[PDB]
Amino acid sequence: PYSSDTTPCCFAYIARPLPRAHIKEYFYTSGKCSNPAVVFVTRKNRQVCANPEKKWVREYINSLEMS
Amino acid sequence: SSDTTPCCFAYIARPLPRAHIKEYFYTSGKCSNPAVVFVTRKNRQVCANPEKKWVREYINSLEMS
Amino acid sequence: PYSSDTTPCCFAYIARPLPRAHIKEYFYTSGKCSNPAVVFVTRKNRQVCANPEKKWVREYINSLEMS
Amino acid sequence: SSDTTPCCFAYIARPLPRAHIKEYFYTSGKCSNPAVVFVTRKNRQVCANPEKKWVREYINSLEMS
């Protein structure tokens, strides 16, 4: 059982770290997706796919739920 | 402005009302499951099984414009 | 090597699902912590510890990555 | 208004300046590593090794008020 509405997945990861100050939110893509992934939402409301195994990705996450 | 790709992991069980669908598109081949997405006037992206008769018929009607 | 500043960890998980509409952000606690955990930041800016293995927790995360 | 607990996973290598510390507290026993937290006037929470001489001395001075 699962939603029959589309679900976002990532098939590519941004190569280098996004500017930390341009990021306001994040969310992990569904476990249903083929690739694990972190999607950062920038302040201009863009959505960027990132690799959860990357050090900067984990640090950005730790920073985001301090705020 | 998004790097994500919409994929489908379930198909709607019953035929969606034809009257409220404004267009359709097929989910990316990158997605594991093949699927037709019917977009409703309220911008709902509903997943449907490409092999279903009603789905093929809806697509045909949307193709004739 | 690691930050010598304090790092937040969770030692208890909220028993039941928080109201989805009261949540604006989330972040996973450091892998350094003894327990894996998800910290939801409410709109009143409170921080609630949650279990990543819980179904509602994963769903809330998937939802937050969409907004 | 938070359910989290501050823990320490590293100790500051050199003695922090005494002049800018307003208080201290020990991290929870729930944390895996024992630690003293020196809070600076800029609200930085710095982790320090309880066994260090300077740490015990700083604590003593903060205890005499």
Query: What residue ranges do the domains of chain C occupy?
Result: 1-67
Find the CB nearest C33 among D7, D44, D46.
Answer: D7
Chain C interface mutation, best of A25, A29, A53, A63, highest count of C Cβ atoms under 10 Å: A25
Experimental method: NMR
Instruction: Please judge whether C8 and D11 are an interchain contact, meaning their C-beta atoms are less than 8 angstroms apart.
Output: no
Q: How far apart are CA D11 and CA A19, in angstroms?
A: 28
Separation between Cα atoms, residue D3 and residue D11, nearest integer Å? 24
Which residue of B5, B16, B55 to mutate against A (max A Cβ within 10 Å)?
Answer: B5
CATH number assigned to the domain covering A1-67: 2.40.50.40
What phi-psi label fits residue B32: left (phi over 0), alpha (psi between -120 and 50 degrees) or beta?
A: alpha
User: For the domain with range D1-65, which CATH number is right: 3.90.940.20, 3.40.50.720, 2.40.50.40, 2.60.120.260?
Assistant: 2.40.50.40
Would the CA dihedral through D10, D16, D18, D20 be positive or negative?
A: negative
Contact C27, A57 (CB under 8 A): no
**Which residue in chain C is spatially nearest to A6 when comparing CA positions?**
C66
Q: Are residues A25 and C67, on separate chains, in Cβ contact within 8 Å?
A: yes
Which chain D residues touch C48 with a CB distance below 8 Å? Answer: 3
CB contact under 8 A, D10 and C33: no
Q: How far apart are the first and last CA of chain B?
A: 29
**Sequence-ordered list of residues with C-beta below 8 angstroms from that of C63, at least 6 positions apart, any chain:** A27, C20
CB atoms A8 and B6 under 8 Å: yes
CB B9 within 8 A of CB A32: yes
Are B5 and A10 a contacting pair at CB < 8 A?
Answer: yes
Residue D23 CA: distances (Å) to CA of A66, B26, D31, D36, D61: 22, 62, 20, 11, 10
Q: Using CA coordinates, name the residue in chain C closest to A48.
A: C65
Instruction: Give dist(CA C40, CA C53) in Å, integer.
Output: 14
Those residues of chain C whose CB sits closer than 8 Å to some CB in chain A are: 7-8, 24-31, 39-41, 47, 58, 61-67
First-to-last alpha carbon distance for chain D, in angstroms, is 29
- Is C5 in contact with D7 (CB distance < 8 Å)? no
- Close Cβ partners of B2 (under 8 Å, ≥ 6 residues apart): A8, A46, A47
Residues in Cβ contact with B40 at an 8 Å cutoff, skipping those fewer than 6 apart:
B16, B20, B21, B22, B46
CB contact under 8 A, B31 and A49: no
Whose structure tokens read 């709109």?
A: C43
